Design a protein around this ligand. Structure first.
Ligand SMILES: COC1CN(S(=O)(=O)N2CCCC2)C1
Length: 185
């Protein structure tokens, strides 16, 4: 692709994080902690899942960023409305305000309703995410495979400001402790 020039510097918003997440000092990395991380509760925190938002809000334009997923077994990545549900159980779908892909149990899927199988020959170590607000597009790229397209959501109905969205996944297996990292420009 040729979207690299729309690169934006994303940082994570501590206040939105599930209470078990550990965000690095530079706000560029997140991982699952062993326990509650000793923060107060608030209405912004995702309660049921190991999720966190970027601080940046987008309402126009073209935006691109990259995320490192090296050695993880499970994660969700994409964008979401600023007003997504934070508490209780919910599915990742455009109806609920999410435009995401994920890895789970050795397969990749797009967060449509129902979910869509992805065809990836080279397991990615870094994912590129492109948002065109005006066009209603969210696209995902395999940086490990020379930028090959993974998935395009088109005809998106954002219906609000967008925020970068992250889920580090649970670590029941002991194989999913590695962080998500925002990669440098
Ligand atoms: C980073 O590794 C730690 C192992 N655990 S956990 O994922 O099994 N789990 C999630 C909530 C209860 C314990 C996090």
């Amino acid at each position: 692709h040729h979207h690299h020039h729309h690169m934006v510097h994303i940082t994570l918003d501590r206040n939105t994080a599930n209470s078990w997440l550990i965000i690095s000092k530079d706000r560029r990395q997140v991982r699952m902690g062993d326990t509650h991380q000793n923060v107060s509760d608030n209405k912004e925190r995702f309660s049921n899942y190991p999720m966190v938002l970027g601080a940046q809000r987008f309402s126009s334009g073209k935006m691109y960023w990259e995320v490192d997923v090296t050695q993880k077994e499970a994660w969700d990545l994409g964008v979401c409305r600023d007003s997504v549900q934070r508490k209780g159980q919910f599915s990742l779908s455009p109806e609920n305000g999410f435009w995401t892909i994920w890895l789970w149990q050795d397969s990749y899927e797009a967060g449509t309703s129902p979910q869509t199988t992805l065809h990836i020959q080279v397991p990615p170590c870094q994912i590129g995410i492109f948002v065109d607000y005006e066009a209603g597009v969210v696209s995902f790229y395999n940086i490990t495979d020379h930028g090959s397209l993974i998935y395009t959501f088109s005809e998106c109905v954002f219906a609000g400001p967008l925020r970068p969205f992250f889920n580090v996944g649970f670590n029941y297996s002991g194989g999913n402790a590695a962080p998500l990292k925002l990669c440098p420009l």
